[PDB]
Amino acid sequence: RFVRI
């Protein structure tokens, strides 16, 4: 849920 991408 953190656009931890």
Place this chain on the structure above:
Amino acid sequence: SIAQARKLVEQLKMEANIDRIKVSKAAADLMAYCEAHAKEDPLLTPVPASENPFREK
């Protein structure tokens, strides 16, 4: 030890009957040798890289 005290005297006697030249004359020969052979000393005058075997033969 009396024999050892005689060979030293003999050696000293031998080392006294030689010929000696003036110090100025001997010092006026190292100068001549150095000035006659100066040109062939690569450590005195840097040698160009074109004929130095340790940089760029």
Place this chain on the structure above:
Amino acid sequence: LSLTVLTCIVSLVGLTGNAVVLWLLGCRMRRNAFSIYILNLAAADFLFLSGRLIYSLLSKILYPVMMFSYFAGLSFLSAVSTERCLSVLWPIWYRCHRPTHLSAVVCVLLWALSLLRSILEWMLCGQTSDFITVAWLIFLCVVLCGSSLVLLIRILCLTRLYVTILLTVLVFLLCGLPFGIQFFLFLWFCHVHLVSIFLSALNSSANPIIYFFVGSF
């Protein structure tokens, strides 16, 4: 933030702190098997600190590259802590029976594990893998301190040494794990992020100051 410049002013020292050590040792000595680990530690430290130097900007390679180095650097830290414990538990084995190039074998082995886990977090994308990550992070926590207190009870049972062991353990823990025990924590109020990446830029900065320089003299 207010001063994310905090980190900019701390990786200033740090980016270069490892650069000289990367070359000093990278040119001379490096005979000690201990030095290999430090060489890989400093080599992998640069990349983390440099990637974070870029965040000034504030896409594709900026994210997997600092996480790959983060878990790479933490591995060669607990690997150097368990190598000094073996040098005193089994001193005869460490001298004459220890195989050569063992450190080189285990240094390239650490490099792989780190890559592999980074991909699987990218395969989770293009599931719950974090447990595994979180769980592997606390493995190194008890491997490090759980084998760096044995070094005290096999010695204490000299005082300018005891201090070193509580110096390095605290640095790896008080300003180490917080960053990674935190990110993944919350992927499943938050200035907790900001404070932590500083500390993570501070741990990785003063690595040579101790694993190398305090010993350079």
Place this chain on the structure above:
Amino acid sequence: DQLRQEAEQLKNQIRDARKACADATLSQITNNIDPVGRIQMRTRRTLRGHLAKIYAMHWGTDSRLLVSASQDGKLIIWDSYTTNKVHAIPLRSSWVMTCAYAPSGNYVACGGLDNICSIYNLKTREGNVRVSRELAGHTGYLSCCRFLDDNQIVTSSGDTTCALWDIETGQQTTTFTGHTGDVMSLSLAPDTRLFVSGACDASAKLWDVREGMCRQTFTGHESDINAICFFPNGNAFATGSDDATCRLFDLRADQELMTYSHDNIICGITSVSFSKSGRLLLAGYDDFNCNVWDALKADRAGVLAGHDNRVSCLGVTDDGMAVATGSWDSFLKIWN
């Protein structure tokens, strides 16, 4: 003391003779000599190997190959132009302090704390390097050895003697004597008709090889003389002591010429050598570096600062194109 009272008067009789041959001085003659400039040498090669400290080194006659000895028990022959290794000779004893390369190039010699000089053959029809002969008879450690030809070699030992050997049989031909202190260095004349030696009684003697007699004795140092080298003309030589000073002697004036000392130098000298024309004097120190001196005016001309420990060996090729220095940090460097 039947006659010990006249040796002192004999010695006093030769003092006043070497002092009535001193009208002038070397400085008073070379005062207006052109300065030698500022010598700047740069490292061209670095020979890596020999894990332990390096104690001895010698150049080959072709000015391309050199041999070095180390305390790990190895003899390595290097090709300096390409940094290649030609041979690696394992020694039977690892305590070595001396190496020489023959003028023909077929043999090398070794010696140390085993009181034995070993001779190796480099040209064999089997591909390896073989021991050719071991020479025994010195009762102290061997400090220097110098080939005369393929079949003769002069060694100096810590038992205060020097010897001349025959290799094809393995026995001494002449035994030189008179020093009362261990001999530490040798130097052969360019014609190899006589040689000088320096011992730990702060004296140097000249001997001729044929008659085996001592000709002249030179005094003036204050402690052990560790290095000695002969001028290119063959009428002078230089010595290096542990009192931080080098001196130049004349064989024809029979006395002292010049001293090379600085007030900021306190460590002893390990090695000494001349350049091709005899204008520069290379000296190695425990300061970790190497000074060069203008021989005719006694001024420093430059420094050679590139070693991390004590400089133990130092030599110049036969055409005067390069200088090689060994050291205790196990590295060999070639300069200019």
Place this chain on the structure above:
Amino acid sequence: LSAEDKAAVERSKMIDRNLREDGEKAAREVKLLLLGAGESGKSTIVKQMKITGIVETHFTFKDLHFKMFDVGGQRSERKKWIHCFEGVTAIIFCVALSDYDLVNRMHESMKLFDSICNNKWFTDTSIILFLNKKDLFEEKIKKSPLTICYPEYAGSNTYEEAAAYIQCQFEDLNKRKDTKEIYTHFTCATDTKNVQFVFDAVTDVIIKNNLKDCGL
């Protein structure tokens, strides 16, 4: 480069790979320097162990290789070659306990010990001290008080104390009290256990040197 010059490079690389193998093999052995006085017992410890300028001895104890060097047969200025042995693992010093009355000899040994222990090169090597002939030493003291050797000796003429007074007068000559330990053993000719004492005296040296190779 030509084929012949490329083959010289290959040969050079081949022989420097063997120089690494020999260097690693020699860094596992421990080397010891055997010093002592004239006929002090140095010619006896070597036979306790399993086993011409200098002599080298080889023995193995619990998968560890030892190399001992003897420099007794060398009457040459010691300051000229003693630096060759710096970096040695440890030093063994043999002192005969019964040389008190003899002539003096004990004083010569205290001087020799004082000179080698306080060397410039040996500033961090450890010293293992052997006090030989502890048996024959007993037959003399009961008929010869220690005052004939140590004048200021304030004690009894008994083994229990006279033997501990020479150990303290030898271990007190140290000046760099901290960087060097001194392990003193009391040997007796048929002691059957000196090699073990050397083993667990050099084990601590190995441990201390391991704490430096890791910079700890």
Place this chain on the structure above:
Amino acid sequence: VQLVESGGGLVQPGGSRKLSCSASGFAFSSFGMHWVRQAPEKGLEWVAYISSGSGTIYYADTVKGRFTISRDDPKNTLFLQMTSLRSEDTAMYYCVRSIYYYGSSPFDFWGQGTTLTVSADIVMTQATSSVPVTPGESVSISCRSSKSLLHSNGNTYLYWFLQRPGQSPQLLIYRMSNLASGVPDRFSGSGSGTAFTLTISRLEAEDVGVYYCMQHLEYPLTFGAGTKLEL
């Protein structure tokens, strides 16, 4: 120093064979080894090479794939595995040792030869195949290359060999101006670049045979045609 080879014999086309060459009297592990063959009544031809440490192998283009070379240093033996033998591989194979360092003399000792009967590249133009001669008079032998053999390090890589009637070749001159240890002082060599000459003075009844010039500049070694000297 000794080299003995065996393994040859009658073979049908397409078959296989294995040749051996066992050393005796020298440090076999320090030498690189070559295979050189000679056709019936024709000249010499290089075949293959193996490195001292067995870390370098070269093959002629005419035997690549079919032939493979190997050595066994603990037993001091050299092998050559050959498969799918054509009718133009019938020759007499030789075992040659060579060592390479600054100042060495390669190609110095040749084996005795084992016979085999079945069923870009520098050229070296040899001189007239036949020179009539009488004892006493001095003669000259001329080789000529299709490329300058003078390298930039100063060396010229030309070699001279002599094959006496009924024997194996022996080295005379290496690198064009050096005399191999064992040959008299009447042999000498000159020339530079692409033209070379070997001159012998006051020949006796021991210089009869054929002379070969060989270049060692590149990978595939090549030989001259060879010139006979009859009395």
